[PDB]
Amino acid sequence: AATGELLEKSVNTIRFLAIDAVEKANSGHPGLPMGCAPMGHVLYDEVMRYNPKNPYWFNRDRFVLSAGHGCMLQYALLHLAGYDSVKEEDLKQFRQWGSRTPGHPENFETPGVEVTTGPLGQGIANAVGLALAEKHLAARFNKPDSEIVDHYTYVILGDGCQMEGIANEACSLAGHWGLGKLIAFYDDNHISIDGDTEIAFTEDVSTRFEALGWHTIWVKNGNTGYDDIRAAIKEAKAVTDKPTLIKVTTTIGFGSPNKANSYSVHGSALGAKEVEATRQNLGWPYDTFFVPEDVKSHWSRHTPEGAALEADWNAKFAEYEKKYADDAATLKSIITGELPTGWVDALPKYTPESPGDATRNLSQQCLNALANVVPGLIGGSADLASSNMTLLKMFGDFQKDTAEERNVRFGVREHGMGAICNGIALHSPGFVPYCATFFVFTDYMRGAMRISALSEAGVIYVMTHDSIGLGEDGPTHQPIEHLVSFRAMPNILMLRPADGNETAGAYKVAVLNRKRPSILALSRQKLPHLPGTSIEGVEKGGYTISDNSTGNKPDLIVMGTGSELEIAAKAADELRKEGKTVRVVSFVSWELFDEQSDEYKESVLPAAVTARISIEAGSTLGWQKYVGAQGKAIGIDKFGASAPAGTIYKEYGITVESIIAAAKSF
């Protein structure tokens, strides 16, 4: 452990790397890194177990910077630790086009960064998911003579995260689950962007956390109380049954003679004059982006020590593999991301003779089928297990005493639920987390969902009661703009299966896409199994289910999704009687369709056929890209109503007669 002048120099190396990176970019946040350098140093140099040359080592401790704006703190540490992702030149490319050092930490750009933060509150919620994953894995695979999974989850958060409701949702669950290895550092600096926190934040954070079930500790001198910080971490790991909140009081911009403790240092370059003044104040003769040789030498030990920690763990796993071969084989799946051979064969198959059912119920069949073949499937609903139909029948509930169970009960915390799943998904490539609620409530958790898409987290979102079909609950519960709001979001699949085969198909696609989240819009009401639907069609996004035309030139093309496909089919039969040739197209997913070749698209929507009709219980916006200019889109562009589903469909014109009336307009 560093001490004396070496400790001071290392801590200041971190502060100045942050100051110089920001100054060069003339953009960024120097405040947090300056005040948090002391705890950052203790954490990466003395406490955390990791291998800088292998950021993927399974049993590594995890670090999460929830106050993402302070990313230079993390980049400085990754650089000093020896990670290949952050070299000297990368620091000099901070916030510049295409660099490994973007304005906010992004896991997909920088190996060593575990999750994507920046939107406040996500980080701490992700850490709860990471700690859940570790506890689950340890409870499920550890043996009396072999403790193979054992790592801590460290997270740094500021006042902004503490004010966000998502943070309180996640921390409430963490306390309830007894996540002893989750250790959070709260940067108590009394400053946010509007200035002093007394302006809008005067609650007793520590007492709130105690109420949530957390163990609490307060380090009053966060700027120079290095031993206090060490001691706090030690006591934190001693308390094994409760997550620990370590409040560390620091002064933002510490070291800056004229900008410390002010909102001015939160997010803008110090400036040439103040940088010079700060260098004199801290006694930093060294120049731009300099790492003193003795500091560099001290930090270099992490490479050989890191290699040895992993070698030690590998030996342990080899011995585990020979005693518990089966458990080892299963754990390897979660560690490598390689799904078991033939998992696809476990998916249900249906025929139009199978009894009709709501896609939400068919979803449950697929979930229980998959639970047997995919060891990493884990998840649950936000207090709606009996409506969402998300219980894995063969398992109990994940709880502090039964962490090995696979049904996770989130309570009424949608947003926290989403971020926790992002944490699970990014813990190990073999996890396949799924979470659920009513489709309309994705609005509550849209922040975490957008992060899923941007961070390439393969979370499967099971959303039921997807339309006015839910009936009586009314407009506050009926989605309308939701499908298009997600078709417009990049890198996320918006699947809306019509029946059993499409539902199984949606799940095949969802499991196969480990780098892109999937949303399944499922119905509350029973739907018939349609002839023409198939697992293979779904992978295509938009495909033909029935066609009585020839030469790829039907008189009419009718397209639909989910519960409205049936209506499109019934209308097509009707129109065929009158002698017209009609093609019925299922658009389970716009995303997958757009990804197909031009040949494929032409084969489904021939450019020559202009008479096109679409039907879907939701906004009509955007359908023009498929129905064309002379085409007609039947939908709902107003809020719903409180009444029996049947009545709403009739009153809103989501009927076979509307398709027919529209057909005779061509």
Add this chain to the structure above:
Amino acid sequence: AATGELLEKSVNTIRFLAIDAVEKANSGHPGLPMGCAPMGHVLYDEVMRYNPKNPYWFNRDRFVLSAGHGCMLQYALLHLAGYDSVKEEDLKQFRQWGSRTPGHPENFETPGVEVTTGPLGQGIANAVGLALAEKHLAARFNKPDSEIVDHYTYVILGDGCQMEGIANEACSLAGHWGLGKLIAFYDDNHISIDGDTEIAFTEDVSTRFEALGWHTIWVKNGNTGYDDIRAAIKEAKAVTDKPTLIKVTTTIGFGSPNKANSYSVHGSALGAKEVEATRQNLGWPYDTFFVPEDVKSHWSRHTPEGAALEADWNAKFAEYEKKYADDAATLKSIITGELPTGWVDALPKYTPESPGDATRNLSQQCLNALANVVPGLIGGSADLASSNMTLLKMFGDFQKDTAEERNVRFGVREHGMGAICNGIALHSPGFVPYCATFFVFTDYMRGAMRISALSEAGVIYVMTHDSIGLGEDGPTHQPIEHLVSFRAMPNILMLRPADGNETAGAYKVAVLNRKRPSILALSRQKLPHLPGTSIEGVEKGGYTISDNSTGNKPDLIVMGTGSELEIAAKAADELRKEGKTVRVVSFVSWELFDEQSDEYKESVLPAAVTARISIEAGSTLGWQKYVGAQGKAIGIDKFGASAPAGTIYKEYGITVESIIAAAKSF
């Protein structure tokens, strides 16, 4: 005050109206009404001040049912109290097409219901807004010899609301603001939809609330402790500097011999057999929807008493208007919703000679100009006042000691902020609340924004840093799908002004729409003032700013919004050099354009002109409805990047050259 058997009969009348209503619709929630009947009775019959024949009386106490699913509780009370909006027949039309008794309370459907609830957590946050409104109004208009504004805000919430992050955000704010007249009843019944709360909710709620700055009380017997409830309310009104949380332990479905204290009674009809058993158990001979004559008689006093309470206040207001004529005139504007004559003339006007500026700064000028002529304008930013540019320079900050101030500092709580504004908007029609954050974080508060649209709350959402133009913060901060995600939402205006004249126009529209929320997408970067822009044009949604064609037949039509209009204008100049006639159209708002006449539309986008180009730094989805099948839409359909804005615009092709390249494809 009722007592003995009369009190028991009154309380049971409430239980049975709820039971019968749910049984007849065979849909609904009987549990909460059955368990909460006692406190509802005490609240509406003994505590609240209101005039059942005038649901709009300004100084009435406000009640909010945050646990919206239990609406039958409120319908039963409104019925008994004498409100004209809930007759016996309305109770029999519960959850049926077009009834005044929808499945969740909607203020727009039922006079007497203050806000729209159903999505959990919104109600308690709305109550915080209602209480803020009363506190602000009292501090601002009360005189030492005249206390004209004085009312309490009562709210009932359940475990579901207590778990939602939005509730913690608003209650954190309520404690910080010392809202002594906010009195919340927490229905502590240990049941949620997944069953017993021990499955996912074991935090110490009361201690969390004390940490937030709330006064706490616990009534252990909420089923029959009528005097304990009364006493608790008495103590709550005595504590004047802190909001009070009264935890009332009850048993859900109280009275039902076989379904009480179980999840089965939460949200489904009891069923014929259990209804009979419940009638026997409580000793309720009376049949379907019956109100005993003695109960009816007891409740009828509220009509003459209510009339007298309001008459009293009216006299008091008349004497107030005589002494303080000026203050009275200003207060009346907030009360009646009638805005001062000529407020429109206060808006700034600009010309292309005016210096260029970011629309976020131009927004501030408009807000400050408006503060002077619109008494009900109040609001602020979620810890981003210095970036959103929302401070009303002539005022201080709203705080427990300075409640008369008009700048509200919400801290980093977007969702709570939105719900609180809905509460203010719905307190009185003259309030014009505005709130702000970066456009990308609308995702955090989308739940409340949707409710603004559905409940017809004229909230003005000031959203800055609307695109990749914000630069270096990166993809986590850059909107992409947001504009279309709101153009798809019913009853909400999605305004994206290009310059000063358009920004002033956007505010004119926003202020005039008191029944529909408005969102303003504002830029971070400086934009020039363009020739052709005007306040009037904005009211049209889509209008021409420059045209060199004749006979309404240009060779090319180029449309754009906000920061991209400038690019479209520059490209048109180039093309006009080559001898083409080009029409430049501004689409400040899709919504406003679609509401215009067919003649008007044809005059801007002549059906005969097929060469159309649109440019907007956002998703291209939906632009097809204006650019046509042969038109081209230039936009961004992927996430952003961390880099200087200029570089991102070039790399993504949001440039004049892209417009020109596309123009030569026609």
